[PDB]
């Protein structure tokens, strides 16, 4: 015979504390996404599990685009019709800034089971070095 | 004489060889390969 690619079950748990405590938004998302799938790939493969744990600090801070700070909605639509259809802008994101970024970093995933249970390897957090308990022990 | 393990011995008298051109054809009826039925989209023929 010949031979595969080796990505059995792997094991590269991590602690990468991607602060991104500043102006790094938008494009910044790609790295959190790519580093979730395994871009450098010490052995990985787009198909195996393991999001390679990451920790985005602050998050509650992003210059955003050039004006999508006051002008861009998200649009969710609940479910119970009554044509409610929820809409919220960004500057309107004061109750839970953590939500965003996590929202953005999503969709850029394989979409489905693998990429679904791969998102949690982010940890929201909106307030710099706080409750780092998510993995207080080891980091980078 | 040793039995079997010959391969054979000799062939029957009768052995009517290769004409085949003589015959062949025989013609397979239409009504075989998956989608047959063939003919026009009117099957013009039954009407003669």
């Amino acid at each position: 015979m010949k031979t595969f690619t080796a990505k059995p079950e792997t094991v590269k748990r991590d602690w990468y504390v991607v602060d991104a405590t500043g102006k790094t938004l938008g494009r910044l998302a790609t790295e959190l996404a790519r580093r979730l799938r395994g871009k450098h790939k010490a052995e990985y493969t787009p198909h195996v599990d393991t999001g390679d744990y990451i920790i985005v600090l602050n998050a509650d801070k992003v210059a955003v685009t050039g004006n999508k700070r006051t002008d861009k909605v998200y649009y969710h639509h609940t479910g119970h019709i009554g044509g409610i259809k929820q809409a919220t802008f960004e500057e309107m994101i004061a109750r839970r800034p953590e939500r965003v970024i996590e929202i953005a970093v999503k969709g850029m995933l394989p979409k489905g089971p693998l990429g679904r249970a791969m998102f949690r390897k982010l940890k929201v957090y909106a307030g710099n070095e706080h409750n780092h308990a998510a993995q207080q022990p080891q980091v980078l | 004489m040793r039995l079997n393990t010959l391969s054979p011995a000799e062939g029957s008298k009768k052995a009517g060889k290769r004409l085949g051109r003589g015959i062949g054809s025989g013609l397979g009826k239409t009504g075989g390969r998956g989608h047959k039925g063939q003919k026009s989209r009117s099957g013009g023929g039954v009407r003669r």
């Binding site: 015979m1 010949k2 031979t3 | 390969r33 998956g34 989608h35």
Partner: protein
Amino acid sequence: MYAVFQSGGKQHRVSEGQTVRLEKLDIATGETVEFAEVLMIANGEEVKIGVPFVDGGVIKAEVVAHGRGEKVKIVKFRRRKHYRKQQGHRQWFTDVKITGISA
């Protein structure tokens, strides 16, 4: 001393191991027989020494061996897409064993 050798579509990861290939119709027999081989395979592994893709080694770069070099596999498959029907078929594939010595 690890695989490098090419032919067919290049594929060498085995040292004292064996690897099937095309047919080597030029000559295969039972025992090996004058099997060419080259470091010139763009194989940058070799032994500790790097050995850039295709370094030197003109005349005697390395060699190999030869296993059974027979058998005719299976992967017949079938096929008459919606387009009415026709086809069916079945296809095998002849290969050659070959093991490999002195990388």
